[PDB]
Design a protein around this ligand. Structure first.
Ligand code: HEM
Ligand code: HEM
Ligand SMILES: Cc1c(-c2ccc(Cc3ccc(OC(F)(F)F)cc3)cc2)[nH]c2cc(Cl)ccc2c1=O
Lengths: 105, 75, 60, 49, 52, 49, 48, 378, 52
């Protein structure tokens, strides 16, 4: 909670609220651009996390269609955002870099 | 291209729809639409306006300067 | 049934064939009344200036 | 039967006091729903006209 | 050649479908008169007559 | 389970003629359809002109 | 320089009147069809 | 069963306009695709009816247009529909491009690059069209634009004289510009078909930039009726110009016949080229200004390679939003400077705006996308 | 940032494919000179020089 850390976290929380995807009930990982690494990582997710991702995205598209947002009570709080997708994508990237490293030798 | 029935997998989602001959086309057009328009205006004014304000000021300054430069000075 | 729109539906809109016959006859009488009123407005707004408001002066 | 559009269908007329449900029900593969709906409604219109 | 269409069912179908084809013929006739401004027929219509 | 299925109330969006759930909707259907088709017919008349 | 002046203004008047009729009716047809989608409701009921 | 689905010809229409899965939430900014096709068909029809009473002879080309606007029955309405339709065409083009830039649609590389080809061909078509009436601006536009090739070392003058068909702009230049302006729109239509061919492989993007396969709706009747409404609004915008201000977007000098001996003092291009005119003349060098001119358009082909953000659309990227609108205001600045004479202070303003355009496209936006990635911890 | 292509295999492949690329470049150059009738180069060729 030192000098620069609380200032950095304050700017990150500011930017998080400014981005505004939380107003549609989305999480950060729901907004990532689907490339081959991300399609593979999404493929590896278990059933429950996949189904939650599907319903959150479907509800956000419905809101965007109606040009509405959720009530303020239901916004995604910055501290509760779960990076459910990060470890899978990290493993997929590590595997692809191993393949690329073998192709050089 | 792609076809319905082959897009993706979805489970445990229920959708309720109402016929168009059963409901209003303009149910809360002004009582709800105007607050939402003000919300969106407020939400985007700070992103859209300052560039064009800077353009307006450069336009007026450049036109005033060009007008004054065409008038001659004594001596 | 006593409603105006209800009788319009029962008589004219239920079948597509009479819905098309009602459309072409409506466009016929709408064309006649619309052109008549539009020209009467353009002529009232421009009272005098046009040639057909002054051609009587120059023709026996 | 010839085009394998469904595994089964049935028509029904369920009656109640001054109201009821008149229609049909069917069971089919996920890539055959459009054809079954099309032929069903076509037969309703054919009997209507 | 086309003898297969001679039967009771085909004449019940034609009797059922002659009013619709009659009305689409009236649609086409009125549409042609309207689109071409045929004075030969429109001179007889009451209010339309004043246009000419 | 599914027995807790219940359609959410569409009371806000319904037309005035079908707000009350204790009356038949068969009498009002022709008026509603006639209004909508009158709108469509006027549009087509203008486009034809 | 512009002999079509008067005729163009008469046409402009007829165009304004026709547009003043046609725009809200076509808007109403659009809203009529889209109302099926704009008031739909979704619910998620996973097996626990 | 259904002949709409099985007939060899109708399957293309069904798989392109009826059963096409489309996102449920595409806004009004997705309407300009169909409006560009409406505009292209309008120009083909009006132009074809103008070619029935036009002669490309240098001694009679000017008079044939007056014959159209004076003696041909409703010739004036056809003439000014064709002229104002070209301006509406470029309005829709720039909105289509800006839409694709804002929402990250450029990640469809084949569709984007074919789009860039369509942009260049429509520009050449509209440039050649303006030469046909043979006014003052027609003549000096053909002179300047054809002379741009003279900057090419060691072959430039040969290319210029080969295109002119002589030692100066003359009858042969007008006759061939008429043939090119006639034939080039059909090539544009074919390339527009390939544009849609590559598009249909993937389907549309949407405002959120998130995949919409979980929520698709059929194209008919939802976007057929929404596109009809947008078309009716395009007709409204066109007829307001044609019937109340037919000369607002044109230049008065073109109503004077061509004169090879004198150039007007206030010569300026059509409004839809002024920004690039501003780019060219801000560089006091012939070859440098011509290269900057070409790169001001071709940089769009480089736009796909500079995307650094892990999100596709700018909806959730405030810094990118601000830089985008600074780019829109900068292009409005270049258009304004393009329409003003070459004097102090407009020269320095135009230089700073030209520098800011390439600085924004090349440097600032990728750095913003990287700062945004770091702020979200990925 | 195509740093994936820095290794022994790729320099070996480039060494293998250099001669064909050079021959295709020579084909392009000779074709251009023959098509354009570029007198600057062709005036030095012995038998061709007599055609001017
Ligand atoms: C004659 C010119 C053009 C025509 C007729 C045309 C037509 C279309 C149409 C009908 C669509 C589908 C509907 C829509 O997305 O609005 C489309 C999509 C698209 N066009 Fe064009 N276009 C033209 C030029 C261009 C240009 C100049 C660009 C970019 C430099 C471009 C890039 C795109 C892209 C990226 C999409 C996909 C948009 C998305 O999926 O979200 N097009 N175009
Ligand atoms: C993308 C399609 C087209 C565009 C953007 C376009 C644009 C233009 C423009 C800007 C003018 C100048 C009008 C003026 O200043 O008076 C013009 C004139 C002309 N265009 Fe086109 N044009 C297109 C297609 C066509 C086609 C397909 C034809 C004939 C087959 C045609 C025939 C003519 C003729 C004859 C003129 C000279 C008459 C006049 O000046 O109004 N155009 N065109
Ligand atoms: C630079 C310049 C232009 C100008 C002309 C065209 C463009 C855009 C353009 C560029 C290339 C092009 O050809 C292509 F499509 F590539 F084949 C077609 C159009 C941009 C500017 N037009 C002027 C017209 C007058 Cl009358 C005078 C002077 C100027 C002036 O100095």
């Amino acid at each position: 909670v030192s000098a620069s850390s609380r200032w950095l976290e304050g700017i990150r929380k500011w930017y998080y609220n400014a981005a505004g995807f939380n107003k549609l009930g989305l999480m950060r990982d729901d907004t990532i651009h689907e490339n081959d690494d991300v399609k593979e990582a999404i493929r590896r997710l278990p059933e429950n996390l996949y189904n939650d991702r599907v319903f959150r995205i479907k509800r956000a598209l419905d809101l965007s269609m109606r040009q509405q947002i959720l009530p303020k009570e239901q916004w995604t709080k910055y501290e509760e955002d779960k990076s459910y997708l990060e470890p899978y994508l990290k493993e997929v990237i590590r595997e692809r870099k191993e393949r690329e490293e073998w192709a050089k030798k | 291209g792609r076809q319905f029935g082959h897009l993706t997998r979805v489970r445990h989602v229920i959708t309720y729809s109402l016929s168009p001959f059963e409901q209003r086309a303009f149910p809360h057009y002004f009582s709800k639409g105007i607050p939402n328009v003000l919300r969106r205006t407020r939400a985007c004014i700070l992103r859209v306006a300052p560039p064009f304000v800077a353009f307006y000021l450069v336009y007026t300054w450049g036109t005033q300067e060009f007008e004054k430069s065409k008038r001659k000075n004594p001596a | 049934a006593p409603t105006l729109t209800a009788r319009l539906y029962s008589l004219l809109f239920r079948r597509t064939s009479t819905f098309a016959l009602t459309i072409v006859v409506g466009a016929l009488f709408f064309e006649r009344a619309f052109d008549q009123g539009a020209d009467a407005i353009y002529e009232h707004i421009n009272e005098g200036k046009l040639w057909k408001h002054i051609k009587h002066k120059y023709e026996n | 039967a010839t085009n394998k559009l469904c595994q089964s269908f049935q028509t029904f007329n369920i009656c109640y006091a001054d109201t009821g449900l008149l229609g049909a029900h069917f069971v089919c593969d996920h890539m055959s729903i459009d054809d079954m709906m099309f032929v069903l409604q076509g037969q309703w219109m054919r009997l209507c006209t | 050649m086309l003898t297969r269409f001679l039967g009771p069912r085909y004449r019940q179908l034609a009797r059922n479908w002659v009013p619709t084809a009659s009305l689409w013929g009236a649609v086409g006739a009125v549409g042609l008169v309207w689109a071409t401004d045929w004075r030969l027929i429109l001179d007889w219509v009451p209010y339309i007559n004043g246009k000419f | 389970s599914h027995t807790d299925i219940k359609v959410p109330d569409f009371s806000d969006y319904r037309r005035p003629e079908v707000l009350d759930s204790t009356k038949s909707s068969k009498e009002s259907s022709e008026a509603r359809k006639g209004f909508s088709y009158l709108v469509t017919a006027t549009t087509t008349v203008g486009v034809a002109y | 320089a512009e002999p079509e002046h008067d005729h163009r203004k008469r046409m402009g008047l007829k165009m304004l009147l026709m547009m003043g009729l046609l725009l809200p009716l076509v808007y109403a047809m659009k809203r009529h069809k889209w109302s099926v989608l704009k008031s739909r409701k979704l619910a998620y009921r996973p097996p626990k | 069963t259904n002949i709409r689905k099985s007939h060899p010809l109708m399957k293309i229409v069904n798989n392109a306009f009826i059963d096409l899965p489309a996102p449920s939430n595409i806004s009004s900014w997705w309407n300009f695709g169909s409006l560009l096709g409406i505009c292209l068909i309008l120009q083909i029809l009006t132009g074809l009816f103008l070619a029935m009473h036009y002669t490309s002879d240098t001694t009679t080309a000017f008079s044939s247009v007056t014959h159209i606007c004076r003696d041909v029955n409703y010739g004036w309405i056809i003439r000014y529909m064709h002229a104002n339709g070209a301006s509406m065409f470029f309005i829709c083009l720039y909105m289509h491009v800006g839409r694709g830039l804002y929402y990250g649609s450029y990640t469809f590389l084949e569709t984007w690059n074919i789009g860039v080809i369509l942009l260049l061909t429509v520009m050449a078509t509209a440039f050649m069209g303006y030469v046909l009436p043979w006014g003052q601006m027609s003549f000096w536009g053909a002179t300047v634009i054809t002379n741009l090739l003279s900057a090419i070392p060691y072959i430039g003058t040969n290319l210029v004289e080969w295109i002119w068909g002589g030692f100066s702009v003359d009858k042969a230049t007008l006759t061939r510009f008429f043939a090119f302006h006639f034939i080039l729109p059909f090539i544009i239509m074919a390339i527009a078909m390939v544009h849609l061919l590559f598009l249909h492989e993937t389907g549309s993007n949407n405002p959120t930039g998130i995949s919409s396969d979980v929520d698709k709706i059929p194209f008919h009747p939802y976007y057929t009726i929404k596109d009809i409404l947008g078309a009716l609004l395009l007709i409204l915008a066109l007829m307001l110009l044609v019937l109340f201000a037919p000369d607002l977007l044109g230049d008065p000098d073109n109503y004077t016949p061509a004169n090879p001996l004198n150039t007007p003092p206030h010569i300026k291009p059509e409004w839809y080229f002024l920004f690039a005119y501003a780019i060219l003349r801000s560089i006091p060098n012939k070859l440098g200004g011509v290269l900057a001119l070409a790169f001001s358009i071709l940089i769009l082909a480089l736009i796909p390679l500079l995307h650094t953000s892990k999100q596709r659309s700018m909806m959730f990227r405030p810094l990118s939003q601000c830089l985008f609108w600074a780019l829109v205001a900068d292009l409005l600045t270049l258009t304004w400077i393009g329409g003003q004479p070459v004097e102090h202070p407009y020269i320095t303003i135009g230089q700073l705006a030209s520098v800011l355009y390439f600085l924004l496209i090349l440097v600032l936006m990728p750095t913003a996308g990287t700062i945004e990635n770091k702020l979200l911890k990925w």
